Amino acid sequence: ASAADVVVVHGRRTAICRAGRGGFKDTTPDELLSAVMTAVLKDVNLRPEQLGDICVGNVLQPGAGAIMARIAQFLSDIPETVPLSTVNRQCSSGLQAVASIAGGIRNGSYDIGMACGVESMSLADGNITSRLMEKEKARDCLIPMGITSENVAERFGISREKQDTFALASQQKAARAQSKGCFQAEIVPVTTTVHDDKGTKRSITVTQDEGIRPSTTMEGLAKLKPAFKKDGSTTAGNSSQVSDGAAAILLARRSKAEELGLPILGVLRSYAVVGVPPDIMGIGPAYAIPVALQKAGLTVSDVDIFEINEAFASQAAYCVEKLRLPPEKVNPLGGAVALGHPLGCTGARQVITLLNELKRRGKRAYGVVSMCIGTGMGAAAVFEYP
Amino acid sequence: TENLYFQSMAPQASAADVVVVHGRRTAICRAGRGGFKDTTPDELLSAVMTAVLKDVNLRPEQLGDICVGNVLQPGAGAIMARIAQFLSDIPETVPLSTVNRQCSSGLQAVASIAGGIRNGSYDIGMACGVESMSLAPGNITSRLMEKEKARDCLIPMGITSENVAERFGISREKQDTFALASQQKAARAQSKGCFQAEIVPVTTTVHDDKGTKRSITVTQDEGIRPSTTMEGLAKLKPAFKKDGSTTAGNSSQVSDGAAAILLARRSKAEELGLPILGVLRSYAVVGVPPDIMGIGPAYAIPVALQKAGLTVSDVDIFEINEAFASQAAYCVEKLRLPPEKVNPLGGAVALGHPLGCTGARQVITLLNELKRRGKRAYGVVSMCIGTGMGAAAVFEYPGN
């Protein structure tokens, strides 16, 4: 517990909605990001100008959303004096934003800052060398992530039934968690418009994660067509749903949090990023997690919760088995198969879901957030709850 | 700052300092019509990544991370950058990400690798910047116009040049004088060989309009135009505004280029026997009004100096980016910098400004000049940033 430690003060997120057909299908990402930035500042009552920097994870906007994010800041009436940037490490971008704010604090650039992630996959739309095909690993960076799911399932022998069992459990856990109110602290309601019959915007308020489908049955999952490959085992049912969402997290040097009387929700203890074959990008967490634990000084047995991103059941299941994780410790409130996976948001989202569960349990504990990353990487972060 | 032992330029040399081991850049070419007009940015970035590793003979898999600054590619060029890594045969086990803080992205890449080292994530990494302005807004809310500062983020940077020229009273003559000096300094520096160490030749193809493909090798910055005269600059039409003072001549030229920088924890550099070209001492990022974004360095520099524990007098060279002569001139006068210390080899009006690259490029240009001089010294790299920011970094060159 050093004065120099980077602590997580507080975080909020939007509900996660299905892309194209859900409540945020007509809502621009700057609006999603503004709602969560605004909520985090208000919740801890931090003067906006106390922010040393804002870092936004984002994957699909031009330039990784730098203009869009800056516009959001101003939509939140956060003053121009507070700077902003964006980061893209694909599916990890949201957690990357956390690591980059942590890094700025440790560089002496500022004492406090905000790490966000956002993605509008509803509003989604490099210039690459002509000799791509001379270089197999360059070529492999264009493999659709859904095909890498199938590659992982075949190389490492993860059956359809394994995948579906995994997905039904993620759905079922998510349903109970939602009913018990586990997501109510973290979600901020967002009021927006959705377009109608005759062109008129009509108002709605989104308070709940749309992809949690308690009607999921094992019979129904087994019936689904493959989503990417003729004789494949990856389906819409055992994959993350394409989604819209935002999340914002306030981080501070411990001594600054104390100076200002801000709560400490968690402490960042380690962050590990490793590279794997893009081909089978899903194996990332299997290699990121051990390095993160080593750096934080821990073993698998010391961790209470692992939030491992469920891009696809194939890769998530493989990682749990390879690492010999106690299954009851993995995504106890469900993961992305149920919650959705708005690319740039998910990493920050996980941190909030993780720490709010550790908080409820109220015991000093360690938790991991980890995900696979397109183009062949894994990231993992270790956090300590007080 | 206020402790018993403080002395403004006292040496500090911890095992934890983040040091710059080495750096290389492409020559910078004019967008659309230059040598890199047909070269994709992955190729530009590959050439510099390859060069830096080879130059210091680092095993590529020793890299803990690669961070690439980029502004105009989709997703800030993450797919592109990763492809470039593999074009350099840097193995998959080395991870990569991209960053966008607009014009500062290349320096931001340096700060982000520095930060990863400070986080305990790795001991050594590569900070890069790249931009193909030859080849390259988003989904924004419907109520932009309800929020003036949001609206202001869509003001063309060329119009913010005019805004700064009018708000702060910087004449056309002031601007042209500045641009002639930048060109003249750049021509001499090129003739003396100042850029020879840092530039890595790139061999690429250009498509001729006869439908013919031809191999060429670019070894020199295309924008350095010794034929610039005062008379010629005074005759140019305004580039953005009817009665304006900003022109193609007193602005940075739209450009293509990449730069790569290897950074390490000092103790790791020493374990591996790697050279130390410089040491990163501070990094400051501040916000200013987007409509006069050019003033950024005037507010970023003082903060960076305070953090590094320095005053303007302690600095030997300021590399201040010359996006526009208006903005650059304002910043030199506001800060009362000795002019001989600002961009001694010329800046972007002459060298060009490939958005994501520049910040990295500046670092390399700065450190190579301090190295030539061979004295222990401090240097500053700073730039204004679209949508209303400034960044500044302090670097220490060892020696004497």
Structure description:
- Two copies of one chain form a homodimer.
- Chain A is an alpha+beta fold.
- Chain A has one domain (1-386): Peroxisomal Thiolase, Chain A, domain 1 (3-Layer(aba) Sandwich).
- Chain A is built from twelve helices and twelve strands.
- The first copy, chain A, has helices at residues 29-44, 66-75, 93-106, 136-139, 145-155, 160-180, 218-223, 254-260, 284-296, 313-323, 336-339, 343-361, and strands spanning 6-13, 17-18, 54-57, 84-88, 112-120, 190-195, 201-206, 243-253, 266-275, 303-308, 365-373, 377-385.
- In chain A, the strands form two sheets. In chain A, strands 1, 2, 3, 4, 5, 8, 9, 10, 11 and 12 form a ten-stranded mixed β-sheet that branches. A two-stranded antiparallel sheet of chain A has the order 6-7.
- In chain A, helix 1 crosses helix 2 and helix 9 (284-296) crosses helix 10 (313-323).
- The longest helix of chain A has 21 residues, at 160-180.
- The first copy, chain A, is globular and about 60 Å long.
- The N and C termini of chain A lie close together (10 Å).
- Chain B: It is found in: Peroxisome.
- Chain B: It comes from Homo sapiens.
- Chain B: Its EC number is 2.3.1.16, 2.3.1.155, 2.3.1.9.
- Chain B: Pathway: Lipid metabolism; peroxisomal fatty acid beta-oxidation.
